[PDB]
Amino acid sequence: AKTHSVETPYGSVTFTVYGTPAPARPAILTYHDVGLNYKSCFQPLFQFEDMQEIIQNFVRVHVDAPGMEEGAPVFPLGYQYPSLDQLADMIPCVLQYLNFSTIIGVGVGAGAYILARYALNHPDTVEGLVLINIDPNAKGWMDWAAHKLTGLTSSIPEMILGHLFSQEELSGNSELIQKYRNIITHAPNLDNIELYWNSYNNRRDLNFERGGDITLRCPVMLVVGDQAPHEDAVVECNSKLDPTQTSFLKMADSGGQPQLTQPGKLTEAFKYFLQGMGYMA
Ligand SMILES: [Ca+2]
């Protein structure tokens, strides 16, 4: 259980490696959403007992985006934070530092985009992808206008929260919502989070086309909550991928962060995803 760090053209990235050496399986590599880090995004899911049972036969690499890791310094003012594409270009350095040749990528939101871009760049290194809340399209001008309007009366934390959770959830104000409102609003590194939020917002098209030559070439499990902010984007993404290689898990009752609210169902789906990939799980 070791925390590492590597220099890349776009700065250093921190990552934690877990598990016994498993040379004949891909590494499970994770990448978290805006506002979160591995701990606030994925730890509840990966510490879930049923998930522990599956992952014991894999090595796991948990990436913290630059500036998001525990105890990260706040970037100086004017820092040019890497674009999502530049974040995907940090991953070869992580894998070569580790001497790993293939991965199954598991990502949420911004993290799902980053891993999908990584896969497009390096498709022989990616055996499968779990993509939670992916929006593979650039922000359209209509959406930009509505976002800038919203930003006139909402703070950056409130806006990151509307990216993470449904509006029903946030007015519901459950104990998970209050906990995450507090996490983000009072984050010591909130200024770094804003930079990543901006990169998210400012992303380009991934450009999937069904029967196209810009496609993912591995199994993919698309995950989203019914009525959650990214439902439409994930539904649309599904329509652009190879249906024989793609499964779509639209979870009722899960909300904006399925990996936080339904780790049990998500773990069971992962199990069958791996079996469909040809791996005993
Ligand atoms: Ca193998």
Swiss-Prot record:
One of the protein's GO biological processes: substantia nigra development
The protein's role, per its UniProt record: Contributes to the regulation of the Wnt signaling pathway. Down-regulates CTNNB1-mediated transcriptional activation of target genes, such as CCND1, and may thereby act as tumor suppressor. May be involved in dendritic cell and neuron differentiation.
Name of the protein in question: Protein NDRG2
Organism per entry: Homo sapiens
Subunit record text: Interacts with CTNNB1.
Keyword hit for Phosphoprotein: yes
Domain of life: Eukaryota
One CC-aspect GO term: cytoplasm
Homology family: Belongs to the NDRG family.
Residues of the full protein shown: 38 to 318 of 371
Subcellular location: Cytoplasm; Cytoplasm, Perinuclear region; Cell projection, Growth cone
Key words, A-Z: Acetylation, Cell projection, Cytoplasm, Developmental protein, Differentiation, Neurogenesis, Phosphoprotein, Tumor suppressor, Wnt signaling pathway
Recorded name of the encoding gene: NDRG2
Tissue expression: Highly expressed in brain, heart, skeletal muscle and salivary gland, and moderately in kidney and liver. Expressed in dendritic cells, but not in other blood cells. Expression levels are low in pancreatic and liver cancer tissues; absent in meningioma. Expressed in low-grade gliomas but present at low levels in glioblastoma. Isoform 1 and isoform 2 are present in brain neurons and up-regulated in Alzheimer disease (at protein level).
